[PDB]
Amino acid sequence: TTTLAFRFQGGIIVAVDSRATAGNWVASQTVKKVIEINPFLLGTMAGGAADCQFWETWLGSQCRLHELREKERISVAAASKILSNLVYQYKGAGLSMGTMICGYTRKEGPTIYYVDSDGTRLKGDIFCVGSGQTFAYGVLDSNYKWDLSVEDALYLGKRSILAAAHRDAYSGGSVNLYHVTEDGWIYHGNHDVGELFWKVKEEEGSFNNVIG
Amino acid sequence: QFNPYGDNGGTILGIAGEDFAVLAGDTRNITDYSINSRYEPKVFDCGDNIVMSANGFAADGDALVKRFKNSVKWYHFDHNDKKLSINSAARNIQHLLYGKRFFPYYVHTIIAGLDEDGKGAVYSFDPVGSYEREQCRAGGAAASLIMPFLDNQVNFKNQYEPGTNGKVKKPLKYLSVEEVIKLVRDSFTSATERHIQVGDGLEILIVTKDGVRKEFYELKRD
Amino acid sequence: MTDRYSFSLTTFSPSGKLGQIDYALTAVKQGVTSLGIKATNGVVIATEKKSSSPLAMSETLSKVSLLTPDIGAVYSGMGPDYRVLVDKSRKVAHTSYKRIYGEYPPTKLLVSEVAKIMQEATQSG
Amino acid sequence: SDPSSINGGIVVAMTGKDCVAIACDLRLGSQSLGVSNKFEKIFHYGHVFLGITGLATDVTTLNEMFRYKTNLYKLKEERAIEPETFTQLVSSSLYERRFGPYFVGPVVAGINSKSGKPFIAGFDLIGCIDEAKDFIVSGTASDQLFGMCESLYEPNLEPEDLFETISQALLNAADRDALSGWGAVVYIIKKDEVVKRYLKMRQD
Amino acid sequence: MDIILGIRVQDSVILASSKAVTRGISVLKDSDDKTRQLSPHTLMSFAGEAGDTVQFAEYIQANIQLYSIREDYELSPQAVSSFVRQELAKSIRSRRPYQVNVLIGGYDKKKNKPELYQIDYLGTKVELPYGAHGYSGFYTFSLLDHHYRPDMTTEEGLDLLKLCVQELEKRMPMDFKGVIVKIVDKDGIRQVDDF
Amino acid sequence: MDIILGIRVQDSVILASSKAVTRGISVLKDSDDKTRQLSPHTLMSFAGEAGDTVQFAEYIQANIQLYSIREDYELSPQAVSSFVRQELAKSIRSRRPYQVNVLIGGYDKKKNKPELYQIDYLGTKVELPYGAHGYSGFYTFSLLDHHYRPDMTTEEGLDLLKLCVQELEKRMPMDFKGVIVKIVDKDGIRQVDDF
Amino acid sequence: TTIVGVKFNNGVVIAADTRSTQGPIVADKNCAKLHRISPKIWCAAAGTAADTEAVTQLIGSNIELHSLYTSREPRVVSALQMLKQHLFKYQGHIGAYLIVAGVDPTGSHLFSIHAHGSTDVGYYLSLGSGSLAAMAVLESHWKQDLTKEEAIKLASDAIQAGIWNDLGSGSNVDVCVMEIGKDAEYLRNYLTPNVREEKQKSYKFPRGTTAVLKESIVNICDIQEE
Amino acid sequence: TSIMAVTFKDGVILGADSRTTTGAYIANRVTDKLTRVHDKIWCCRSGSAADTQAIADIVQYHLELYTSQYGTPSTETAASVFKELCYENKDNLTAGIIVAGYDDKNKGEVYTIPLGGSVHKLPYAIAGSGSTFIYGYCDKNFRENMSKEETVDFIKHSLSQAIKWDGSSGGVIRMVVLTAAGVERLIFYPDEYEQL
Amino acid sequence: TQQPIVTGTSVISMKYDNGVIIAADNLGSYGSLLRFNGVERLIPVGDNTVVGISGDISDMQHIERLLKDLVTENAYDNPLADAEEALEPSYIFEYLATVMYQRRSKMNPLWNAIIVAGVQSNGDQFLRYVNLLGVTYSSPTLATGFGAHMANPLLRKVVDRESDIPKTTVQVAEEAIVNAMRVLYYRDARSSRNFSLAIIDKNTGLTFKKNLQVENMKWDFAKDIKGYGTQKI
Numbered sequence A: 001t002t003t004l005a006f007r008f009q010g011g012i013i014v015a016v017d018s019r020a021t022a023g024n025w026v027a028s029q030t031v032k033k034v035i036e037i038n039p040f041l042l043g044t045m046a047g048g049a050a051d052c053q054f055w056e057t058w059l060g061s062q063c064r065l066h067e068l069r070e071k072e073r074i075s076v077a078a079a080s081k082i083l084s085n086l087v088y089q090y091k092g093a094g095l096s097m098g099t100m101i102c103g104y105t106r107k108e109g110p111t112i113y114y115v116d117s118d119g120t121r122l123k124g125d126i127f128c129v130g131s132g133q134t135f136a137y138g139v140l141d142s143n144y145k146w147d148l149s150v151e152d153a154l155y156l157g158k159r160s161i162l163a164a165a166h167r168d169a170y171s172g173g174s175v176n177l178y179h180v181t182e183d184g185w186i187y188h189g190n191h192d193v194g195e196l197f198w199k200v201k202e203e204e205g206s207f208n209n210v211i212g
Numbered sequence B: 001q002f003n004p005y006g007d008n009g010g011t012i013l014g015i016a017g018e019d020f021a022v023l024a025g026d027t028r029n030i031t032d033y034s035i036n037s038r039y040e041p042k043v044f045d046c047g048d049n050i051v052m053s054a055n056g057f058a059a060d061g062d063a064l065v066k067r068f069k070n071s072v073k074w075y076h077f078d079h080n081d082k083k084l085s086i087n088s089a090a091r092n093i094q095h096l097l098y099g100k101r102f103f104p105y106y107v108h109t110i111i112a113g114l115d116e117d118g119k120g121a122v123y124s125f126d127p128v129g130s131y132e133r134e135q136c137r138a139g140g141a142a143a144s145l146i147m148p149f150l151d152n153q154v155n156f157k158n159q160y161e162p163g164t165n166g167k168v169k170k171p172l173k174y175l176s177v178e179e180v181i182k183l184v185r186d187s188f189t190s191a192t193e194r195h196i197q198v199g200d201g202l203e204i205l206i207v208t209k210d211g212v213r214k215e216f217y218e219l220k221r222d
Numbered sequence C: 001m002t003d004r005y006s007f008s009l010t011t012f013s014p015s016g017k018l019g020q021i022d023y024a025l026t027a028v029k030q031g032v033t034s035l036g037i038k039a040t041n042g043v044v045i046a047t048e049k050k051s052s053s054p055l056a057m058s059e060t061l062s063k064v065s066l067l068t069p070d071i072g073a074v075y076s077g078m079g080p081d082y083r084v085l086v087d088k089s090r091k092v093a094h095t096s097y098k099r100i101y102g103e104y105p106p107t108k109l110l111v112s113e114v115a116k117i118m119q120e121a122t123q124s125g
Numbered sequence D: 001s002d003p004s005s006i007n008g009g010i011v012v013a014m015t016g017k018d019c020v021a022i023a024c025d026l027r028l029g030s031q032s033l034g035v036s037n038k039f040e041k042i043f044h045y046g047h048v049f050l051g052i053t054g055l056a057t058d059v060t061t062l063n064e065m066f067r068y069k070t071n072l073y074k075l076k077e078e079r080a081i082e083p084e085t086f087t088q089l090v091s092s093s094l095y096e097r098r099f100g101p102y103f104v105g106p107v108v109a110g111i112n113s114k115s116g117k118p119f120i121a122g123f124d125l126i127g128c129i130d131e132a133k134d135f136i137v138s139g140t141a142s143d144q145l146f147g148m149c150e151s152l153y154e155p156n157l158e159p160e161d162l163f164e165t166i167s168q169a170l171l172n173a174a175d176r177d178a179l180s181g182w183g184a185v186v187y188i189i190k191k192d193e194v195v196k197r198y199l200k201m202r203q204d
Numbered sequence E, F: 001m002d003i004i005l006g007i008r009v010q011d012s013v014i015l016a017s018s019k020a021v022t023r024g025i026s027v028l029k030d031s032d033d034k035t036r037q038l039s040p041h042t043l044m045s046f047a048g049e050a051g052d053t054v055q056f057a058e059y060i061q062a063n064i065q066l067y068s069i070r071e072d073y074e075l076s077p078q079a080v081s082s083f084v085r086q087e088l089a090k091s092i093r094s095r096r097p098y099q100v101n102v103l104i105g106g107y108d109k110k111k112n113k114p115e116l117y118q119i120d121y122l123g124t125k126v127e128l129p130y131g132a133h134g135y136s137g138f139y140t141f142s143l144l145d146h147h148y149r150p151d152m153t154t155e156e157g158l159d160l161l162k163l164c165v166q167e168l169e170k171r172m173p174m175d176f177k178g179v180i181v182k183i184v185d186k187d188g189i190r191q192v193d194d195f
Numbered sequence G: 001t002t003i004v005g006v007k008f009n010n011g012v013v014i015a016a017d018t019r020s021t022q023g024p025i026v027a028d029k030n031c032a033k034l035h036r037i038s039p040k041i042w043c044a045a046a047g048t049a050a051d052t053e054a055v056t057q058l059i060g061s062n063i064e065l066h067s068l069y070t071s072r073e074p075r076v077v078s079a080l081q082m083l084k085q086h087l088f089k090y091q092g093h094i095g096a097y098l099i100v101a102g103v104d105p106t107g108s109h110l111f112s113i114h115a116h117g118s119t120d121v122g123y124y125l126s127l128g129s130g131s132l133a134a135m136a137v138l139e140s141h142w143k144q145d146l147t148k149e150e151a152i153k154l155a156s157d158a159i160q161a162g163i164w165n166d167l168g169s170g171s172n173v174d175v176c177v178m179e180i181g182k183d184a185e186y187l188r189n190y191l192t193p194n195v196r197e198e199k200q201k202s203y204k205f206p207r208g209t210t211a212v213l214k215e216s217i218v219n220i221c222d223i224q225e226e
Numbered sequence H: 001t002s003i004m005a006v007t008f009k010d011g012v013i014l015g016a017d018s019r020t021t022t023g024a025y026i027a028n029r030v031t032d033k034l035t036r037v038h039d040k041i042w043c044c045r046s047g048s049a050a051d052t053q054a055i056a057d058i059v060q061y062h063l064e065l066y067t068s069q070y071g072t073p074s075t076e077t078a079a080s081v082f083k084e085l086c087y088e089n090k091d092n093l094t095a096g097i098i099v100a101g102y103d104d105k106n107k108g109e110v111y112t113i114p115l116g117g118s119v120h121k122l123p124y125a126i127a128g129s130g131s132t133f134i135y136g137y138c139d140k141n142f143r144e145n146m147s148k149e150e151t152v153d154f155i156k157h158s159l160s161q162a163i164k165w166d167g168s169s170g171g172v173i174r175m176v177v178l179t180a181a182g183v184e185r186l187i188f189y190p191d192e193y194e195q196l
Numbered sequence I: 001t002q003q004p005i006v007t008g009t010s011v012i013s014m015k016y017d018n019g020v021i022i023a024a025d026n027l028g029s030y031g032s033l034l035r036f037n038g039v040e041r042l043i044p045v046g047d048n049t050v051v052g053i054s055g056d057i058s059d060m061q062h063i064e065r066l067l068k069d070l071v072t073e074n075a076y077d078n079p080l081a082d083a084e085e086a087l088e089p090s091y092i093f094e095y096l097a098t099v100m101y102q103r104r105s106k107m108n109p110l111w112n113a114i115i116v117a118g119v120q121s122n123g124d125q126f127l128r129y130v131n132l133l134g135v136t137y138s139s140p141t142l143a144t145g146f147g148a149h150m151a152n153p154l155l156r157k158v159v160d161r162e163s164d165i166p167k168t169t170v171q172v173a174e175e176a177i178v179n180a181m182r183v184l185y186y187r188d189a190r191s192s193r194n195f196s197l198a199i200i201d202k203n204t205g206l207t208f209k210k211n212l213q214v215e216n217m218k219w220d221f222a223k224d225i226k227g228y229g230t231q232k233i
Ligand SMILES: *C[C@@](C)(O)[C@](*)(O)[C@H](CC(C)C)NC(=O)[C@H](Cc1ccccc1)NC(=O)[C@H](CC(C)C)NC(=O)[C@H](CCc1ccccc1)NC(=O)CN1CCOCC1
Pocket: A001, A002, A019, A020, A021, A022, A023, A025, A027, A028, A031, A033, A045, A046, A047, A048, A049, A050, A052, A096, A130, A131, A132, A170, A171, B101, B104, B126, B127, B128, B130
């Protein structure tokens, strides 16, 4: 899978691919790897499909219970730590999860937390997760600056997933884009790689390795 | 050492139409190179206009269907005879499957029916409960043979408008029930030719607003 | 109990002649007549069954031999030399052709293989 | 670890009315890493076409080997090798490595120049021949190709119709396999003209 | 040996190869040149198992130099790459195979074209606009897919290569101690001393 | 987590801990603080298996902070180190042990002395003038055996620490992305922002 | 695979199904498993497909050379002896399981041979994955002094049992009859009880449906004159 | 497999069951395990069908060539040739062979060759999986210098019991009688020997 | 997890027009040793059901006691225990199938394959299989072990599909079963000559036949088989 999230001047960009595999069998090209926990919180999924879907859906329930009890939106820190403490209980049992918890709150500002199934929890500005993470990192790190336009940042996230979809055999299908602000997350569409690749090739003049 | 799992073969197929859905399965049941039965029903009416099949290890499949049928019964008791919607059925099945995350049900599950807007719905599950709604899904032994054909013929993948160079895709359409059943029958005839575990008979359950109807067709017995 | 004859027994003489080949051709001249004629729709090969004794059963001695289903051979000269060449020709048709290509060799190539075996007896030790 | 699925790739062949078609994808990888998108798997020796899937070093080695052997064949026989004869040569050559085999799935395709008869064949890694009337499949998406071919195929298709059928069989099979795709080539073969077409496909 | 990269531009081929030699716990050397000149217009970089790498590289070098003396002629890059591939394809079914991956960068003087061949230890050969062996390619191919054009100059090729090395220095766990860079063009082979 | 170092000088304890967090192929982060303040004059650095390290460190932190509120008093470094050791010694015979090694640097306000304790995942405690966990000590102990004196200043301790880090940057294979340095003295805990 | 042999009054009959497999996939639906060793010595093959072909062709080649050398028509016991010694030497690694039958100047014969090199004699035999299904039919209907017509019937019924009940076997029944004082008659596709039904739909595409990037003529001809 | 050879007044008799097994499937129910290596030297075969056939074929070849040069070989000589093959190839063979023969000088002789390739000359011998169940019976009922009819009954009763208890043995009881009079083949069907 | 010790081989069965037939031999094997020659492996439950069991005999005896206890329990506070509330084949099967799957799910199976044969209240034929894994299936013919490989092909020639059931009489069906038992005696190394057979008919009820023997065996052709190829005598 390839998933990424990064912080910049205008908030957070989150982009993921849509492929599910069973070994070399391509099980699906239409999976949703972003979960919308609330209007200010997003979760990304990489690893076991069931593990990710079940526990991130469960996380949504625990975040909802927090706001009923405390009359206040859960912090990104607290939400990420609920998931990391849960997987830590299951450590050694064989769960497979690589996730990013991305959101805005007034007290924290825009925040990204990496959480995985061996128990690691890390705050940071940039993360790429999954089988195709290295390919995304290659494009992302070279064109990254703090002060991209929202338009340029959305494109870079889209382009980094495209890069990984191309090179990584276990990533592909389509690109789902999100932008997180003060006012919440905004969906910026599903982009099929079968059309996007050729569009990007022509307009950008990239992918000169391919017969086009 | 004792192995608690087995492989009973078989293959299943769900297709969603505009105001209908089908769930088809072959009726052959096998172990190794033996035929256990030529007619052992694998697709089941579970009530509330929902059809289900859990293909793979038949004992786990039967157990799961039995537990879901019971879940529908207790949903009626606990919530004033309310109709279990297909989306709600799907989420319930995820919890049934993920409950045995560390000793899984060895099956690929498909359910079919109508959503709350009356539109055709097919949901698909892995052994430990990850799920997705789709227009198309094949599961089981000959899934690898059937799915690419469905991508091509139901979702019109890799097909373009003639004379447009290759820039206008074939536009997506809902298929009629007559057209879907033709694709189902050809899928299973093709799978039977090339997969040894597929054959004997084809049983299709069709779900509409009017209810659940059945159709049966002979398949090759070799 | 050693084969010490690792050197050629056929060599060039001062005049450029290969003596043993010429002498072999002389042995062929003494041998019984055999012929071959090619038609449009076939080929014929023929020879005399020169019987060494009337008590001998000349049917048992086959001067005309099948090599493949579509190829036949006849000779003039030393009969035992012919017999072993027919054995080798039949075998080389299988080993160097039929077991590779799944079909019998064409006439010219089987001839080429027999020719090779006869050349080697003209140069080997 | 499994040599037949390190590099990935597929080949398919089909017969039509007075014609044959053979097609392949262009991917070469090291498991998950895509390396090359120009690695063609179809070769030709005169009018006989050979597709090879499997371990890429053996694909290249066997191409060079059959070029070698068919060149010598032509010098000695004074004619080009035919598909039926070439099939037997492939089988012989694979089986002589019985206990240390080439990890490949070869596919022969062509038209016999004398009889005019369309011919296709496939082989396992040790040289067993499958001489099909209808179609032959090979590679990491062979299951997928079998399914596509068995449903899409009908006999006696004209060359330009057969092109559409084989292309759709390849493309849709490749898109359900992680280790196949990255471009594709289709050869349409008639008794004395051969057209080669590169297909536009999704690049993931 | 860890990272070897190659990029073919308009009129040259650039090879970049890491300087570190590490045995277990310690970095034994930080200035190792992981390359051999095979002929005046053909350079081979290499990486793989200790010992095997240099032994194989020098063995190929000796053979190509022998060919050059015998014929008084330089083999084309394509011909050298095919020779190397066959040696590796022979090796893989031996008692003890050579565990060596190589890049061959050459300038073909006949065609007036740069050429880059990537060959792994199995004998898997491909001609590429850019190439890498080992874990390097997981980072560097996506970059090159974005930034590469076929008509780039040698200076543009070196800047594109700096962007590859910066990414590897950021994201790879091992300290590979920088790279030695060498350019192969019509005038021969030269080393970029400051990188 | 890779390198954690500690050195006890005249009037302070200095802890240096690497910034890299690496999972498999990629360096996920280059600014990670591998430490927790247990009390105002006691700092614990840590390294070991992913997840276990932070979970254990924060668990110890919570317990010492609980003690501090209950008694309105700061436990001595010796007392905190003995508590930590017992938790690890208990852990090693559990169903799933904590794979975590720690250094505890503290200033004892009663005795007016800096103290450095090295404790491994088994519960093996030693008080030392200088300490290290993992492969670091294979390089750094010999250095400190040469250059260390007990009456050194904090500035001399930092220079001696630079000499350790330079050696680790020269000879270790992994890029650990530098170190965060923290000083523990009579005035509390502070971070050296430029190193 | 299902293969059988059945002796009768004046000869012997062998039969086989026509399915070959690759994992659970059917690679060929009309495989030919009756191999000719010599004109009147034929055998049915089961096991590793390449091995059965290679072993029948090698021994068939050497039998042909032996026949020419000795001026005698080949004997079934010779094919048997040469097959078993070759298979024994390779200690089971050549996965050939064969039913060897034929007529020669000594009479009519029926043998089986296994991959490790053991042979057996019988009036009726079966081999392959469907051999139990076939042997059940043979044990129920075989008698002494069968006619030609009765033996063909029994042999094909025994293959059918394999076709219908064994997932390893399928498609068609191939038969070869070897009678004393007659040419051997190979009956390819003697029964065809598994024709596919007509499909519901035609999948012929409109011309221009597939997107193309480039076209070019391929030169298959040699270098031209002038 | 259940096999035995028994010396008696007029010579020796070999006996065997007719079952060949692949796992628990009976591959051949009418097997002939009594094989001729010379006119009046025969053997009983147990263990691998492939191995014992290969060995027996080689021994038949060696004794045919012995006969061409030196005349009729002794039973001891035949046993020695079996031994040489079984001993020297012990790592690669699974063969348990009983050699039995009739000379006019030595009369009836029996040699047993178990797995190791050792040789043991005995008045009678039993071998194969089913032999375990009849050690008791055979030891109590064997006498030297029995008549032909007594020895046929002794073998029939013994192998009947071996068949009854061993699932790896079954079918018909085949016997081969070796005397001065010649070579006689006997067969006994289930309906006869089961009711004993 | 265990291993089976004392074992029973094939159980075979089929439907006919008015009922069902089931059969099994009387042997308890101890590996290759044919240890126990008087073991009954068909166990009737009431006058409408016969449970045929193969596999581990210790586990068979446990199952036998469960069924015996099930009859006792059904009679409790049940005035219609010998009428409308009598145990049905379908009830007995589902109980066993539940137990089998529960035991496999605890990794401690009952090491058996079971066929429940009977006739229901409404006259309908019942025939269904269950094994150590909890796998269940029904078919016009059913067989365990070697019987699956050898008996089913023969029995399927009589009843190939559902529509053949009314056309098959009890004489034809019994003949097919008896022949199948002979074939198994020829070919299964862990079988015996002696067997039991049970017919459950909707009209004539339960007929249980003990001490049957395989008869009309062909061994005569054995005299003509000599050597393994070249031997002539
Ligand atoms: C694409 C990516 C790089 O792998 C990415 O991480 C995605 C992200 C998901 C979609 C959110 N991950 C997957 O696609 C996983 C990869 C994976 C597989 C197996 C274990 C861990 C990770 N894919 C799945 O989880 C997969 C989704 C199905 C195909 C829709 N499910 C399985 O492979 C499934 C369950 C595996 C399993 C079993 C027991 C415990 C835990 C996990 N396995 C099967 O269905 C088995 N088999 C049956 C026959 O067909 C082939 C598959």
